[PDB]
Subunit: 166 residues, 12 copies
């Protein structure tokens, strides 16, 4: 599963070391997810632009809110969050591609679903890790973030004419 | 001057090619500036944290507002903005360093002043270029951004016990 | 006409008996209409979901506002409103069907138009009855509700690419 | 216990089948609970009406908010919520009775307490099921709903001159 | 009926003379009704005071809003509204009594119901008169005022443990 | 009367043909009325300018709100509203004159009163027509618009030192 | 002086008897003052109407706020406020006259100044009495009311082209 | 009198020593009064709970606002406010009792009236002392606090079916 | 170019004569542009109506804001703005056509793009003229209006699936 | 550990007895924590006062919000919260000291950190106990309170120039 | 011209010396302009006072906003703003006169127009100077201030019955 | 004392002559105090600038609010307020000095404390004078202003690490 792979990678290399590692992974992934959403906001062309464009700002605001909470939780529990664009790009498991105007609306929606599916899996790894290490507060952070990501997947999938397929 | 160097670099490699190039430079530099401000927000320790920390969010919001306006102006005039973290990091003239908690408040304030001084110079290059190519709208964008950056320099310098020294 | 049929059914079995009967019919029909709108809100899939989904909440809020006003007017004039789900389902002239995700956006929009067309006809019966029995207040309630329903039909029809066809 | 009975009934007839079943039970029960609260809003007579009547709207709004969240969580995790008045009435474990103005304020308050006691027990079954099947998000939904129901029981019981007696 | 008596008295002594007369009667009666409501606000003692006292301000605000609309409609259609306390007291069909703290809550509620029952009957006379003289605007004013008065009667009656009994 | 003339002209050349015609007349007349009010807003000179100038914006906003409601009601009932400046100018019964700064405040106020007197008469024709054709919704629209116009006449007349003289 | 006359009349016929008497005088006078202001609001014609008319509502709201505070202070200290229109009219030292549209703007402004001059003198009597009887709270009420009345006199006098002349 | 006793106790053991002492007494008494009000908020059972419970929060907020103003005035004039729970409990003249759910609504209302009667007497002592020592600012603080306490007594007494009986 | 043609026409027939002429051209063109946008608002049918319809109101509000600013700037600098519908229609370079419901969504979007492209060119002529005549204030007005028009073109073009193509 | 000691003390002397005990401990400790924060608010002197002083009100509001939620949860689950200042002082594990102005800013910040460190440990005991006794709702209350306390420790520590050191 | 005289005086006695000088002139002139406007606010008597008096506060707020922006721009670019009342009075080119109540409304309006005409000319000098020295930001500040002053002149002139006559 | 000196100077050269004189002294002193506060706002450099700078705007707004109330009270009671910068500077007992950036934060805070200490003493003279002449309204104005000034002294002193030392 994607979950097993993320776990293995996050824990590859203190009593809360795994929790700190998975939070830092989320710092990098949220920053890249926000960049991807912003690319859709700017590069999209096609019918529906006038409601999809501002929808991207809602998603962006929510991702950046997650980023701030995740990073500060990591600081709070004694860690050190990534805080440069090079660190985000290098350590994120999400890939970016050069923006192009010729991407279709359908392609943008598919990419957004892939991003939130990835984030949902990362958060599940966060749940498993925080349960293991007994960090109830960080467990709750990951639960709320997963729930929000799953709701986003349902809605974006519905726009594509599909079910959530979690 | 820094201005001459930025101009040479921006115009190194259509009727509005230089304007598009300087806007795209600002896309990269604003994204890196925002990342640097966020690092201060997270890593700062020392007396004054409780007002400087939220001040960093004000600065961040303003930089991200500039980013959206600059990128969309570039799209509008027929360009293609950078839209990946790797593109921002590679093409920005601002350098980032790994976050460390041992940086002093004075060091953070000095770095912020350097960032806004750089941005002010970039915007002057934007003014010169848009005057050259006859783009009144983009000229006004750069004017407002420069004015805001200069005000920020005055205030941050005052916190350091210094004059603006533009 | 649908109007003649509704009238006959409402008045089938005091000085304001017909008015009380048509108000109670509206209690049942509004409750079922709200349930139908909610089904669209939940089950819809297809392009346009991201603006149609919240539009369903606007419609729902408006129907529930009508329900409260209609029921309380019925209480006020000496009647007794339906107030169980079984009473609503039994006495409403609107039918419901099990939700399915395979209904198209076009099918949902068509069903919504049928619902508001029905409601508009019921309200006309309300107008005729309240004119007959001299209830100016309840006449005004039905007028406003009809006007709102007719506007809704114009807008939903326009989304379908059609004229209002009242 | 009521909890054991609800569990047996919900699970009577995929990795999250029990969770989907208990969510769908809540869809039906919340819809019936809302109808019961609305009946109190409309039919109540007696001293205290002027503050109890609007209190019923607060309760109604909260139940309908729960309904929307519960139904959409069920959709999100791959289920299909009840979405007709007949389905709600048939599958709910709550009974309704024809409205009558001769019910006392004390009788209405007692019925409301019974409704929230039932809901609290259903949510406990939801907790047990979601723990069993490892659904942290739906577990949190049921926890918050139970906590809110228990608070409501304390306050309504206090109005009756009684302790919460959970 | 009270309606027949009010009509006879209003029309006792131009194309809109009866409409002007019934509006002026409402000017006097609304001013006296407001004074009566204010007396309840000030003199009430007994359980329920803490919600009934502010309820009286809601009623007062609504009566004074009616007064302003009624008076200005009378001016607008070429009349001359009563505008002294002596004119209000003399021409109103409502009687006032010296305030006393020994009136019970039940007595205050009964008096309020009598006031709104009277106003509802006056407004019916307004409806009949404006229909007779073809004044659609003033007819609508009286309709809305009657509807509001009837709703108030339902709610106040409910507080007394009674039905509306219009 | 002006009313008889408007009726004759509106009905000069389906079950709701007269209603559609009078609504379309109002589309043209409201658009011209708004233009006339705007001319006063811009060209006025004289004592009182500082409160009369913003008063013109209130009037303008109200006329444009009427225009939108009237046009959309016409669409809703199966008609086709005028929607070009040439159609408004040609079909309106209101005349416009070239703006001049030498018009007095008194002259502007007199012209405004003439405009609202005309509109009030048009709305009366709307009332008669909608009564004839049984359109309760459009009847209510015209009633509210007439009532608002009559109130405006009272207030503007008062500013001139005169009675409403409807 | 007017002050000496008011004092003599108020105290003409317990440790706070004079304070209760002067508060009750203010209940009657404020109610009559409000009625007089309302008459100006309705009957005024002439240039300036469009700002003077709403100014009358500001004055009215302020007088009614004073009335509520004065009456409730009287209740609070063991008194019984006037609470009928006949009591207000009989015991007030302010006279009212039948409304007429032929009163000039200048006449209305002069009457308003007379009213507030009277109120200011009554409040001075309130100050003297509350100082005598040691009621600091009621002294403060009268001080604030006097200060507000004196400010109103300055502003209304200025509109008349005059100084305050207290 | 209670006033004489409070004075004797406050002044029992600089130019503003008595003023500082009475302010500090109010610090202790307000803190205990707030605790007593909170006990009612939590422990109350009986009809009326649903409006009395939130009323206790209004009272609590007002007492805590008084506490902050009183304490800071004491600091401002050169004193040192009590600032531990033991100091509040020891020096307050108000007694507390263990919470019990078996206290009636009537008992809670009676206790609240006793508390505000005590506070009103303390504030009178504050008035006498600040007059003696020439502290106009602190005199005004006590006046406003007394006036507010007396109003609270009127309203709470009215809920009990009684007059204020100050 | 369109720019050269507009310039020639505007200047065809004082130190700021050309500036006054181009402002007056904008008065006429903005009024016609607003009428065209309103026609789309009313006549549109097809998928997307439910978000495009309110989008037309945003565009309309922005055009009318431009109209007021442009007209008042013209007054301010000593000119006389067009202020009748006939003057707007005659002098505008934009043509209108009779509304028809059979226009497609694509056709409406294309017409809107043509309108804003025209306005953008007019504003460029405004820039050239105000630079020539040394009117910095009116130059800034045209710059902001052009920038806003260009942004609108980007967004509307994106909805059509196209680039801005300025 | 502090956690082991708190557990032993809380459980020293029904199915939810331990949960009730730890909630009641939090009632006492939150009340004392609020008193300590208030002492800092009042007694602080030194550079930074102007932002630290209002920061203390934010902390105070948050502690009092926790207090209300904790106490009402205890009532809800069948307990009886401490509700006198003597009970809070006696049963709290936090000590208070007489206020003195000679405490430094650094001393106040250190004391605040000790308070929140204590609260964080108490909440961990709450987590362990509620897990043991199966109270999911109270577990969530303690989780949120712990998370908030840990965030507060990070921020206050940062103001001191230190890391969180949980 | 006034412009030539201001220029000569400002530049009478670094790369931005003239810009700093003209900004400092504006600091002095804005402070004096605000004082003059305040004198009108206080000393005015005559019909129209009730709308002109608050209009003076709008003007005052706008002038003080200009003052803050101008002064801070001067600081920002390396200057030192006047910051005493004696410096403002001495260096301003505006004269003040002792307040007198016998000035007419017409006289006050004439003086206000003279003030804004002066300010408009100063801002033109600011435009010329900032163009000369290449300060785009300060050029924009002066442009906006001039545009606002010219609009104010149009409106105040209109109140006087005159054209703008710039 | 400073108080004795101010009194002697104010009364050095009608029944309220001394009150008018002390109010006019406050007009001059408040205007100079505002100028001094503004100088701090602009010229301050040093750690804490980012919270002290906006604090100066709060102080400025409060002083200007006092100025307006004081001046208008003086007008109201028959006086004539200073209303030129030269009158303020000449008659104020506060001295100003040329702004310099080399003033320390500590120096600015000390000057602010001196200003408010002076104002507090002036207000005491106002209290003595208004008591002497029997002006209760102006006495209350001075009381509130003194209380506010004393609070400001406590807070500013606390920022300096000192007690209020009134
Ligand atoms: Fe943050
Ligand atoms: Fe954007
Ligand atoms: Fe309701
Ligand atoms: Fe929903
Ligand atoms: Fe009115
Ligand atoms: Fe519309
Ligand atoms: Fe009241
Ligand atoms: Fe405080
Ligand atoms: Fe305008
Ligand atoms: Fe609570
Ligand atoms: Fe500033
Ligand atoms: Fe003022
Ligand atoms: Na009707
Ligand atoms: Na006093
Ligand atoms: Na959990
Ligand atoms: Na420019």
């Amino acid at each position: 599963t994607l979950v097993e792979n993320i776990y293995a990678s996050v824990t590859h290399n203190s009593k809360n070391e795994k929790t700190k590692a998975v939070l830092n992974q989320a710092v990098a992934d949220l920053s890249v997810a926000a960049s991807i959403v912003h690319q859709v906001h700017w590069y999209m062309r096609g019918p529906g632009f006038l409601y999809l464009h501002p929808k991207m700002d809602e998603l962006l605001d929510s991702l950046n809110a997650n980023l701030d909470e995740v990073s500060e939780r990591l600081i709070t529990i004694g860690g050190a969050p990534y805080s440069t664009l090079a660190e985000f790009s290098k350590h994120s498991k999400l890939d970016e591609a050069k923006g192009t105007y010729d991407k279709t609306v359908a392609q943008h929606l598919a990419r957004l679903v892939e991003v939130y599916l990835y984030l949902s899996s990362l958060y599940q790894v966060g749940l498993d890790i925080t349960d293991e290490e007994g960090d109830a507060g960080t467990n709750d952070l990951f639960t709320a973030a997963k729930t929000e990501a799953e709701k986003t997947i349902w809605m974006l999938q519905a726009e594509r004419g599909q079910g959530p397929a979690l």
